[model samples]
Target: SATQSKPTPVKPNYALKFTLAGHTKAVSSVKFSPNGEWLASSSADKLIKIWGAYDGKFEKTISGHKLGISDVAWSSDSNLLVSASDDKTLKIWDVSSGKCLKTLKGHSNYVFCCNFNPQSNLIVSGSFDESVRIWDVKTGKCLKTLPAHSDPVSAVHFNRDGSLIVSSSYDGLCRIWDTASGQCLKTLIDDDNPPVSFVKFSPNGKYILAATLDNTLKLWDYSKGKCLKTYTGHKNEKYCIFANFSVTGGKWIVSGSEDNLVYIWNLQTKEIVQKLQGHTDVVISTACHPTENIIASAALENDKTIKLWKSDC
Candidate 1:
């Protein structure tokens, strides 16, 4: 059983690299359809692009915004897609015919992020107007606005069960709210901490992960309102954070930094397991495949390509 020598060199299995390059301006967000069949990207071109990720094929480019498209998401059913724009509105689209379904308006400034609740027909958005608002997805009605953070809210996300909402802001606070009543459950403000750029609840909805501009990641106990761990290895501001859970109870805490690198940290051990580097610009946002190690990240500067990285290490 011990007779194996170093295995022969195995060529990388790369079929083809496809560029989803339809956006004329800088692309802001890209998400894979839940089924992994379609890709949606938002752009400063004032358009959202839909492409077939597998075949490297182009699909429809949806345009409705008068200004740059800032963020986008597909509904849990994958029947509709929603996008926010600097034009001061959010647009929900009919994916098939590329018709705008609903254009929700209220924000006086840019809507940076808009995400639907995984279990319900509710949309949450954080804006440059310095607040996070919840919307009734079907009727296009603004329901509740949480005005706790000192600075403009950057990102908003709800827990898996749709019971709680969490938001991060440039104000250096990560606030948790009761989704139904719109009441603040936790207010985390640290003067010495970096401005929070993004916050997310773990998949199981047990803990909170907040990425800051100080190149650190904070793992917090949602129930106890206590800091669990402050992860640091990055030397620049951390821009994004997502939990990539392996099967069972294991998960990798992934983050992108202005340092132009993405680091995968093991949450439990507080260990840096993998260091990913490819983007030439500041990595502003990153996401991991829900089912695999594949990651997609966006950069700040030129060479504005939505890069895909798979794990073989």
Candidate 2:
């Protein structure tokens, strides 16, 4: 029997793919490599675990930090990783060998967040010492230290071409910096002045997305220092929860909530499209696959688990 008919359009149907457990303490951050081959999760257990992005199988554990790891970032080529820890240091690791390649030391307090530039030659880190430091990957030297914030720095990120950096702090401000000159370009603050817990540059490098303690995420045009839109409906007043755009089409923004749910919001309409629930505690960090409809989320000590979600459509 042969019948000819038009094919129906397929809609994205994201569902739980896998639930992973290994860390003994709260997981602070999770990130997918730029090449989309691995998922790295860092924890308060003082270790970083690598998992297969597709299968969610345990690959290896990197253990060297003397204290809890707060954040992790992958090199552009996916061969290396940089991690910030409560020990007041950052370490570079060879991902395949699970060995520490270099230790960057400069911050006087706990290093809270880190990011690798697109060029793969520079690393930027934010610390509780209220400073943002740039490090040369090859020489393991502190290249520049910017007095970034009045309070603890919660997050730091580099722009698409690595020409600019953005940092957010508990001081209720997000500032843009010129990478080469190390000069503050602009400072963004909401009228309410809620503490910003996480900040990232948009994929196109035209805007900045900042998650603040007011249970909202704001999209700002850094050049004009204007907030264009605000997305809400998730709870985030206590922990340092992260939010970012969806990978496939940039049509949606995904974030972990203090209500123990994963939230997906329509980028343009500012509506919550879906909520994936499974975690029993606050979901603090999330990572989107580089080229697929997959997301990795990790929870607090009550759950201590990592869950991967996928869209079959």
Q: Which RMSD values do the candidates have, in order? A: 3.7, 2.4
Model 1, stretches more than 4 Å misplaced? 1-19, 191-193, 235-250
Among the numbered candidates, top lDDT falls to 2
lDDT of 2: 0.92
lDDT of 1 by residue, 53-91 (tens): 555367888987899877888888777888988898999
List the candidates' TM-scores in order.
Answer: 0.87, 0.96
Stretches of candidate 2 exceeding 4 Å from the true structure: 1-11
Per-residue lDDT of model 2, residues 148-264, tens digit only: 999999999999999999999999999999999999998886577789999999999999999999899988888888888889999999888988888584478899999999998
Pairs that collide in candidate 1 are none
Compute the lDDT of residue 45 as modeled in candidate 1.
Answer: 83
Candidate 2 has what TM-score?
0.96
**Poorest stretch of ten by lDDT in candidate 1:** 8-17
